[PDB]
């Protein structure tokens, strides 16, 4: 494509939403606060505005990255693939742990789409490049690849990952988790990757840690000199309660 793209266009009211959610985040998290929300939006708009939405690079986002620097405890990181709801619910109940989307930068961009045009200097609300059909180097795809690499690269000690046990590929080598995150876990820093395979909750009494795609993930991590551990969440409807109440006798019966 050239000016007409295959993907949804910039989220309606994008500029207001970014600034709005930047203020809510910087009030609620004073350890930052030094941050100027008008300044971060300038750095974010600057990354893609008046640029060709198929020629965007990591460097375009460096301004934004510097303004959004945040050290998250490296030992409290949760990665996730396809099971977005339970991942974020988990960090809402276990409030010392973080997903990418609980950081300032991840929080700004979550569920939003954005792109510009080669010169019009306007935001394109009509359409934006689709990763598959249009081009991989688009404002949205390049943003998530850059923040996701940094997030995984910082992780230390025990890193957790939540996977969707109801997908045909529980571990997907072509996901951001499979492509970027797993190859940026440093064995000098990381002792263990521990996977949680969330069952669809109906009937899947199978040990999904023996799934061939989990065996593939295990081999990748093992070759990085990191310990791979894997457990099943058979009852997602009881998971949050059991994490907070590990001495409840209805939780321990799962051994």
């Amino acid at each position: 494509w050239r000016q007409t793209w295959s993907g949804p266009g910039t989220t309606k009211r994008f500029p207001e939403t970014v600034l709005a959610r930047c203020v809510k985040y910087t009030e609620i998290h004073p350890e930052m606060r030094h941050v100027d929300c008008q300044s971060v939006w300038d750095a974010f708009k600057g990354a893609f505005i008046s640029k060709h939405p198929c020629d965007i690079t990591e460097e375009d986002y460096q301004p934004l990255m510097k303004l959004g620097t945040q050290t998250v405890p490296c030992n409290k990181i949760l990665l996730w693939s396809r099971i977005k709801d339970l991942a974020h619910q988990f960090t809402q109940v276990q409030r010392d742990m973080f997903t990418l989307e609980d950081t300032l930068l991840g929080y700004l961009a979550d569920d939003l789409t954005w792109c510009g045009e080669f010169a019009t200097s306007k935001i394109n609300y009509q359409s934006c490049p689709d990763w598959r059909k249009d081009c991989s180097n688009n404002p949205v795809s390049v943003f998530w690849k850059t923040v996701s690499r940094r997030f995984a690269e910082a992780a230390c000690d025990v890193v957790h990952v939540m996977l969707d046990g109801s997908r045909s590929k529980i571990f997907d080598k072509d996901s951001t988790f499979g492509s970027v995150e797993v190859h940026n876990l440093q064995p000098e820093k990381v002792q263990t990757l521990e996977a949680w395979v969330i069952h669809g909750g109906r009937e899947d009494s199978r040990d999904l840690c023996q799934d061939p795609t989990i065996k593939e993930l295990e081999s990748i991590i093992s070759k990085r000199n990191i310990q791979f551990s894997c457990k099943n969440i058979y009852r997602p409807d009881k998971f949050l309660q059991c994490v907070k109440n590990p001495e409840d006798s209805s939780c321990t019966s799962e051994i």
Binding site: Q94, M97, V158, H160, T192, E194, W196, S229, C230, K231, I233, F239, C242, V243, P246, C251, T252, S253, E254, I255
Partner: peptide
């Protein structure tokens, strides 16, 4: 696993 997060 590690039981840094208690998952049975």
């Amino acid at each position: 696993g590690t039981m840094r997060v208690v998952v049975y």
